[PDB]
Design a protein around this ligand. Structure first.
Ligand SMILES: Nc1nc2c(ncn2[C@@H]2O[C@H](COP(=O)(O)OP(=O)(O)OP(=O)(O)O)[C@@H](O)[C@H]2O)c(=O)[nH]1
Ligand SMILES: [Mg+2]
Lengths: 1112, 431, 174
């Protein structure tokens, strides 16, 4: 009752399993189905501990003993030994080769045996390199005992040295273990006196007798460099210092800095780094001086591998040389931040400064330059092709800020943090990279923590954490306004965004900056309208394309912000912006047109920016009425909508949407002589052109003009509405020349719906708004597009006109339900409901979800309750109102079981059945399966009752008779009908002779397969005919005769498919042919060629006919 | 000289790439050292597409090898042709992604990617006329799922005028027992569909079935699945490494086999399929292969090209055979008035002829289709994802790294739109 | 590599750690410093050769933000709880259930330093354990360590076990 511990558990979950695999290996070796699977399972098991390999440390004793006991066996084969090393390699992979190898035997009785083992190992064996790789590392650990080889004594250091020097040129992975072996064997006190000069001479000769062109030479030089580095690392200062100058002199003629190998340069840099420390006691050494010049030149390496080594060397060397020569190292680091340098030099200097800060090799005097140096790094960005460099520099500067913060005391970093607080909060929110923002936020949090007392620190910490920063869309908008409230984080952000991000190379960044400035301007009207708006009106006429696009959006947003701030106090807009800004904003389109800038690919951004500016100015009520600027804007808007086909489809809808949004604001802003009326001249002129452009051969122009007409206000459409409605209806219709124009019909319906929603409803005024006189024509036009199934090489593009029609009908119903409900007739409402239900059972998963949503929105509605909804009481039960957000209609597995229940209602039985037919038979396998399952589950209650099944069959036959010669429904329905007559649903109709369901259906089937070239229809008919054999009477004689005629079809595949289907239909059913007559027929069907000359096929057919008693 | 740089990522992408390199190297007549000892001049006329002339006539592959853990990089280094790879092209880390997209995308993988960008630039600077790139990884892993979707984005942002090809490998519950498989696959598909010109899906479920039933095996291994993958890749890259009348490089292919930007997934195949060791059974004829290839049995993707519609189909016949015979054979197949008519063979097919036969046969044909039947596997992956998304079980592992449910919802919405588009172009016919 | 590699090398050599000490008592936290040697201070300690990082927060309102950053992450949590208090325990339970989540491998260590035990109506070890839901916590090793102002003892083995568990995980030089 004082302190208790929690219920612990072993970290290794696969303990029994791993040991069970380690105890069944003397049976595994021998086969490739037991050794490839067993070793494949060990790899997967070991991959679950790569991040935290320390958890498997306790299990590094038995796993090794279960393998060494087998390896040390003379009776075991070689395949088991090599398999033993293969498994051991995987263990060293996870943990490592610097700890797991310290447990193997290291006695004196394990030197000669291992040396002999390796002797037999043939280097020419790629199927067993793991064995040699492990043996080279095991033999090196044995060379760490105080014993002397003299007691063991063509010698043992003559056999071990020759084998070690052999793997210094190989290309396999074993070249790394050779360096460790040579470093752990030569550094011995009895090996460094008789053999430390021979190896040095050999290495010096190899470094000179090699070149960077050959392949083997590169590997040899790499191995020699690794060996020398390992020797200098594991070598005392009283043994390597003598030979430290010759090695450096030999390494300088290697000209590693001038080559095409990164590994060689890295190894050389690391070797010279280690040499520099070897000279300096734990400067005077000429090598150390040279060592220095080398690392700083290495800081300009064009690889993100050697720069880290160079920085580490510059950081470690300075920690030895006195402060007399240390002020030189820091001075060079600062020279790497010069303007005439590449970002690589900046990154190297930042790494060097971080090393110095973490190692305390820096004085407060250097901070004066470090502050300005790190402030220039965070704002480093240069253009270069289709991208820009600067991520690594800023990341490096952020890493430098964090290290210095964690090193010195709070007092020693007061001015530094006080000055950098403004640079980190900017680089942590308005940045294009996510990692840089996270690093800046972490550095700011670290600086605020140790410093403790920080003006407004906890707020910025809680508002900007590791997760909140992750969203750059909320950083520019959500986090942007919070920190902006502080008086010491306002102008720095606005100026930064105006200088850097409105002229960026990425357009998304410019858009985000423009959207952020809209909110940042609310908390600074004077500054934004006195110092910022002038600079932006100066950048609109610059040679840079993106700069103008950004400045236009910035000015447009500032204008709307100042308009909002003025409306909040009931004041005009001129109070904020002087006359100079008003005159400048009005002289933009003129200058852009006089210079001919609306050409080429770059002309799209200019047009978009101009449209956005015009929209923002019209939505702010500017004093531009009665001025040529309005005419110029109108001409530009008309030209943009006319030249839409030239714009790429990737950015074609945005331009049209912006133009439509700007046109609606412009007219409602200037075209109004007096309240309630407008200038008849401009209205007449605009209506003229719009009624002469919807008949423009091009489809893009028609779509643009339709969307423009749809976005017009209500007062402008007063007095002239019957003509616009007739034009829209004529455009939505189709003609022999206009067939592949689905977008046109879509936009027409959208504009019709928008106009109907805008004008509303008015009694006794067909020209002013919609009323009970023209509503009938509107409904007839909206319902005429439902029977749209455009089938070009782009798929069924009639769905684009079906969805828009339903959306327009729903809006019209919702509008008329709130005003004059009498307009909503009963027959029209019933037709609309049936059409909406028909679309709630299509093959496409996405088109079925929107249909169901529209159906639920039309049904569930009581504001006020809609009149003329069929079976309204029955559907309220089918669809509970508390289950709307719990049925994914996009899944056919959740859509079929519900829509199928509508068949019970006589009203919802024709359209629903027609919609389920196309889905019951189709191509998709999952949809067909679900539909068939739903059908079989629904028929369980309408089969024993001959009244319901009879009506269902009658309706099905009636539907079959109405879409005859139509291929969009005939073939699917044939497969469906087959999907049902095989399930045996109509087994209550097979007890009748010449049953009608069968007579009419058989006639309709042969009325569809007549002269049918589509082999699919022929196969469907052949399969359907065989299903009618269950019906006795004349129906069974007619089916046999029809099947016999198809045996001599023009195509040979059909002659065989019919026989194959007959061979199955005669065996599945019974009481069809005489038992004695049945053997001969089967024999003839199995002894007949239906892909050979029709000379014999006709005779074989006549034989079967005579045997079955059928004339021909 | 149109060069094609190759890239390798993950363990499955670093195991298939080395095998493909070893395979193609046995057709261009190159030995482990580097010298050339061929017996035909038609091999050097287009060898620079994947090699570079060096001192002494030594051809060197342009391959970048990348992993977040060492083992895989250790293996290829000691392979039968691991000495032909440039020692400076191997870059990797000491900790993997633990089968976590974020672990190899927004954290561990976001650092080593910088080193991969320098190597790519160095390799591109040597080519006189760069064309595109290639990548091979897995969608069931964590370093081959997130660290390879980053490289594509970088290559697209820095080189928007270059082509990008990939060879994704969709995982299976029959080959893998991982539980978060649907997450990584969906996160990779969300990024590939947005910035990819071509894709070659390889189902681990179809290969397993073909190796179990057809080849009759009790306990198949990754060796059996890789043997067929290496064959298919080579059968597909036959018109990019050998001459022929049907001249069409990577760009021309992407312009012909991919009409719509979003729709770019293919369904590669190969036949006859055999196991390792025994392969040279008999010399198959032209019509036998013409029927064996269109067999769904010989498809590397577990779908059904029959139920749907073929958008773009091609063929690359191999072995000693004249184009006249292939034309005559295809003529009767596309004719109903003949006993040699078939209902499960496309009509419009861009066939080709090649003299050099494959390795282990005198005849072989590759199928490069683009049917809409692939939507099946897409819808299968969405159901598996929703099976665990509804509970958000194991969902706090990705959110704790930096991601958010918004990305998953956007990926699901994009996959649904792609499935709807695939289902839309199933009735696209000139009438 | 490059950054994470150097960070791991530093954490393994210098033997650095990070403890996220939280709590509802200010007097209870001062006793921890006497042994080891919304508000936000970063005070780095050096007890037993461990260069600890005592990050003491003043409000549990913001804790996800102080749990991990871009460079390093949290490795421990010394949450202080009042036994006599019975109303503000639901907030602590909710914070512990939200912050600490499940993981595929081990997780940070917890030490509910309960102070003020001699007061009347003080909940015993098991009682406060059941009041916070510590049996439903998986991937984390836990210990409830009492503390009384009268006697003031039984605090050494708790910190000893905490250090042995936080060191045997990451540190592996010995
Ligand atoms: N066909 C095939 N699939 C493989 C092979 N190796 C792994 N896979 C598949 O790869 C998926 C797992 O990804 P891996 O490649 O192992 O992972 P990784 O990319 O290295 O990533 P991390 O484990 O996260 O570091 C599973 O679906 C495996 O079935 C192989 O040799 N052949
Ligand atoms: Mg891996």
């Amino acid at each position: 009752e004082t302190l208790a511990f929690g219920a612990a558990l072993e970290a290794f979950g696969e303990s029994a399993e791993t040991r069970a695999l380690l105890g069944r290996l003397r049976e595994v070796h021998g086969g490739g189905a037991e050794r490839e699977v067993a070793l494949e399972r060990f790899r997967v098991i070991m991959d679950k501990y790569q991040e935290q390999p320390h958890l498997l440390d306790p299990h590094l004793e038995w796993m090794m003993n279960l393998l060494l006991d087998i390896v040390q066996d003379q009776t075991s084969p070689a395949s088991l030994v090599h398999l033993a090393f293969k498994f051991l390699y995987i263990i060293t992979k996870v943990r490592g080769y610097k700890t797991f190898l310290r447990l193997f035997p290291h006695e004196v009785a394990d030197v000669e045996p291992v040396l002999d083992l390796v002797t037999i190992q043939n280097p020419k064996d790629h199927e067993a390199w793991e064995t040699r790789y492990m043996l080279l590392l095991w033999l090196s650990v044995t060379c760490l005992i105080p014993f002397d080889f003299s007691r063991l004594d063509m010698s043992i250091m003559d056999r071990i040295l020759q084998i070690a020097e052999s793997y210094l040129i190989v290309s396999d992975k074993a070249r790394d273990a050779a360096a460790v072996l040579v470093s752990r064997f030569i550094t011995r006190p009895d090996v460094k006196q008789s053999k430390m000069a021979e190896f040095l001479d050999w290495s010096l000769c190899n470094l000179a007798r090699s070149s960077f062109q050959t392949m083997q030479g590169v590997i040899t030089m790499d191995g020699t460099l690794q060996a020398l580095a390992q020797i200098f690392k594991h070598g005392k200062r009283e043994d390597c210092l003598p030979y430290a100058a010759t090695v450096l002199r030999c390494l300088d003629g290697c000209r590693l800095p001038e080559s095409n190998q990164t590994l060689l340069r890295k190894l050389g840099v690391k070797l010279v780094q280690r040499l520099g420390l070897t000279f300096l006691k734990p400067d005077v050494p000429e090598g150390v001086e040279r060592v220095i010049e080398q690392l700083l030149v290495g800081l300009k390496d064009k690889d993100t591998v050697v720069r880290w080594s160079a920085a580490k060397g510059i950081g470690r060397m300075a920690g030895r040389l006195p402060r007399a020569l240390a002020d030189d190292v820091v001075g060079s680091v600062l020279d790497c931040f010069s303007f005439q340098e590449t970002d690589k030099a900046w990154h190297g200097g930042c790494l060097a400064l971080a090393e110095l800060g973490r190692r305390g090799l820096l004085l407060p005097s250097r901070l004066v330059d470090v502050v300005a140096v790190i402030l220039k790094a965070l704002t480093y960005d240069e253009k270069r092709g289709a991208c820009s460099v600067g991520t690594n520099v800023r990341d490096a500067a952020c890493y430098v800020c964090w290290a210095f913060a964690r090193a010195y005391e709070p007092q020693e970093l007061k001015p530094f943090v006080t000055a950098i607080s403004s640079a980190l909060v900017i680089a942590a929110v308005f940045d294009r990279d996510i990692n840089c923002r996270r690093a800046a936020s972490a550095a700011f949090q670290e600086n605020v923590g140790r410093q403790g007392t920080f003006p407004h620190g906890i707020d910025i910490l809680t508002t900007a954490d590791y997760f909140a920063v992750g969203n750059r869309s909320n950083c520019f908008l959500v986090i942007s306004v919070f920190i902006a409230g502080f008086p010491e984080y306002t102008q720095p952000m606005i100026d930064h965004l105006v200088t850097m991000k409105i002229s960026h190379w990425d357009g998304v960044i410019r858009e985000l900056a423009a959207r952020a400035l809209h909110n940042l301007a609310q908390q600074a009207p004077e500054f934004s309208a006195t110092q910022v708006f002038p600079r932006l009106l100066s950048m609109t006429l610059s040679p840079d394309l993106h700069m103008r696009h950004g400045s236009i959006l910035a000015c447009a947003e500032v204008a709307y912000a100042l308009y909002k701030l003025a409306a909040q106090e009931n004041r005009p807009v001129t109070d904020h912006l002087d006359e100079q800004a008003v005159q400048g904003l009005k002289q933009i389109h003129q200058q852009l047109y006089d210079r001919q800038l609306y050409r080429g690919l770059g002309g799209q951004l200019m047009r978009q920016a101009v449209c956005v500016l015009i929209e923002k100015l019209s939505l702010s009520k500017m004093p531009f009425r009665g001025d040529t600027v309005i005419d110029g804007w109108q001409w530009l808007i008309n030209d943009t909508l006319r030249h839409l086909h030239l714009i790429s489809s990737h950015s074609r809808q945005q331009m049209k949407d912006a133009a439509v949004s700007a046109l609606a604001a412009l007219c409602s802003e200037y075209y109004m002589k007096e309240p309630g009326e407008a200038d008849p001249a401009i209205q007449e002129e605009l209506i003229t052109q719009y009624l002469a452009e919807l008949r423009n051969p091009e489809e893009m122009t028609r779509c643009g003009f339709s969307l423009a007409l749809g976005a017009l206000p209500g007062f402008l459409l007063k007095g002239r509405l019957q003509q616009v409605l007739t034009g829209l209806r004529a455009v939505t219709h189709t003609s022999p020349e206009d067939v592949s124009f689905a977008e046109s019909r879509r936009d027409g319906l959208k504009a019709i719906a928008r106009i109907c929603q805008t004008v509303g409803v008015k009694a006794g005024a067909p020209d002013e708004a919609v009323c009970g006189e023209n509503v009938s024509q509107i409904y007839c036009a909206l319902l005429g597009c439902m029977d749209d199934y455009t089938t070009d090489s782009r798929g069924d593009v009639g769905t684009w006109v079906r969805k828009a029609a339903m959306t327009s009908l729903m809006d019209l119903t919702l509008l008329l339900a709130r005003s004059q409900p009498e307009l909503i007739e009963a027959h029209t409402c019933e037709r609309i409901m049936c059409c909406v239900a028909q679309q709630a059972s299509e093959k496409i998963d996405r088109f079925r979800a929107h249909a169901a949503s529209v159906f639920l929105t039309l049904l569930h509605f009581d504001s006020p309750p809609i009149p003329h909804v069929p079976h309204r009481g029955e559907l309220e039960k089918l669809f509970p109102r508390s289950d709307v957000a719990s049925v994914n209609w996009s899944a056919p597995s959740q859509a079929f079981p519900r829509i199928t229940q509508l068949l019970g209602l006589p009203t919802y039985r024709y359209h629903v059945l027609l919609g389920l037919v196309v889905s019951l038979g189709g191509l998709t396998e999952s949809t067909i399966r679900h539909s068939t399952q739903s059908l079989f589950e629904y028929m369980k209650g309408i089969q024993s009752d001959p009244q319901a099944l009879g009506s269902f069959s009658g309706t099905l036959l009636q539907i079959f008779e109405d879409n005859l010669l139509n291929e969009r429904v005939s073939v699917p329905l044939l497969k469906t009908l087959d999907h049902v007559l095989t399930h045996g649903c109509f087994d209550i109709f097979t007890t009748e002779e010449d049953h009608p369901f069968a007579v009419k259906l058989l006639a309709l089937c042969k009325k569809e397969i007549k002269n049918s070239k589509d082999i699919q229809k022929l196969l469907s008919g052949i399969a359907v005919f065989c299903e009618m054999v269950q019906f006795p009477g004349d129906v069974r004689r007619q089916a046999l005769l029809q099947l016999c005629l198809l045996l001599c079809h023009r195509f040979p595949l059909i002659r065989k498919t019919t026989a194959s289907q007959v061979y199955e239909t005669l065996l599945t059913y019974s009481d069809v042919v005489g038992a004695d007559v049945l053997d001969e027929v089967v024999t003839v069907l199995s002894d007949t060629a239906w892909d050979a000359e029709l000379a014999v096929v006709r005779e074989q057919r006549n034989r079967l006919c005579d045997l079955l008693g059928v004339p021909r | 000289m149109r060069e094609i740089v190759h890239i390798q990522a993950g363990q499955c992408g670093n195991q298939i790439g080395a095998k493909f390199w070893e395979v193609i190297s046995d057709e261009h007549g190159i030995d482990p050292t580097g010298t050339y000892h061929g017996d035909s001049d038609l091999q050097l006329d287009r060898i620079s597409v994947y090699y570079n002339e060096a001192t002494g006539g030594k051809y060197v592959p342009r391959a970048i090898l990348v992993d977040l853990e060492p083992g895989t990089m250790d293996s290829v280094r000691s392979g039968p042709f691991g000495q032909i790879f440039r020692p400076d092209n191997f870059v990797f880390g000491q900790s993997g992604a633990g089968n976590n997209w974020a672990k190899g995308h927004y954290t561990e993988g976001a650092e080593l990617v910088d080193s991969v960008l320098d190597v790519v630039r160095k390799e591109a600077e040597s080519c006189d006329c760069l064309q595109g790139f290639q990548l091979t990884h897995s969608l069931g892993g964590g370093t081959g799922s997130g660290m390879g979707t980053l490289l594509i984005s970088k290559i697209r942002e820095e080189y928007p005028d270059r082509i990008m090809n990939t060879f994704s490998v969709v995982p299976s519950p029959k080959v893998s027992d991982t539980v978060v498989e649907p997450y990584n696959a969906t996160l990779s598909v969300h990024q590939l569909v947005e910035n990819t010109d071509e894709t070659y899906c390889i189902d681990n479920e179809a290969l397993y079935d073909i190796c179990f039933r057809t080849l009759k095996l009790t306990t198949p291994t990754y060796g059996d699945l890789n043997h067929l993958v290496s064959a298919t890749m080579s059968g597909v890259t036959t018109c990019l490494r050998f001459p022929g009348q049907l001249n069409a490089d990577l760009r021309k292919l992407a312009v012909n086999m991919v009409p719509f930007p979003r729709l770019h997934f293919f369904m590669p195949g190969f036949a006859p399929l055999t196991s390792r060791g025994s392969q040279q059974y008999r010399a198959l004829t032209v019509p036998e292969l013409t029927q064996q290839v269109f067999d769904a049995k010989n498809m590397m993707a577990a779908c059904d090209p029959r139920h749907g519609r073929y958008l773009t189909v091609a063929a690359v016949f191999r072995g000693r055979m004249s184009m006249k015979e292939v034309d005559e054979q295809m003529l009767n197949v596309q004719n109903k008035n003949s006993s040699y008519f078939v209902e499960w063979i496309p009509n419009n097919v861009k066939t080709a002829v090649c003299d050099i036969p494959p390795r282990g046969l005198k005849m072989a044909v590759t199928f490069i289709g683009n049917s809409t039947a692939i939507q099946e596997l897409f819808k299968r992956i969405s159901e598996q994802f929703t099976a665990m998304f509804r509970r958000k079980a194991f969902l706090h592992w990705y959110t704790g790294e930096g991601m958010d449910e918004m990305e998953f919802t956007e990926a699901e919405s994009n996959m649904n739109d792609l499935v709807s588009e695939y289902q839309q172009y199933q009735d696209a016919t000139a009438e | 590599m490059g950054l994470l590699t150097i960070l791991k090398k530093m954490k393994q050599k210098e033997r650095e750690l990070r403890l996220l000490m939280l709590g509802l008592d200010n007097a209870g936290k001062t006793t921890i410093l006497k042994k080891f040697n919304l508000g936000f201070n970063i005070k780095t300690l050096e007890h037993r050769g461990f260069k600890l990082n005592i990050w003491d927060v003043g409000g549990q309102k913001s804790l996800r933000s102080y749990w991990r950053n871009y460079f390093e992450s949290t490795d421990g949590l010394i949450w202080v709880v009042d036994s006599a208090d019975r109303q503000r325990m639901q907030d602590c339970q909710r914070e512990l259930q939200s912050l600490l989540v499940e993981e595929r491998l081990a997780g940070a260590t917890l030490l509910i330093f309960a102070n003020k035990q001699d007061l009347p109506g003080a909940l015993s070890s098991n009682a406060i354990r059941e009041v916070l839901e510590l049996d439903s916590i998986r991937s984390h090793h836990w210990c409830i360590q009492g503390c009384s102002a009268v006697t003031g003892e039984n605090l050494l083995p708790g910190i000893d076990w905490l250090l042995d568990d936080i060191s045997s995980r990451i540190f592996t030089a010995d």
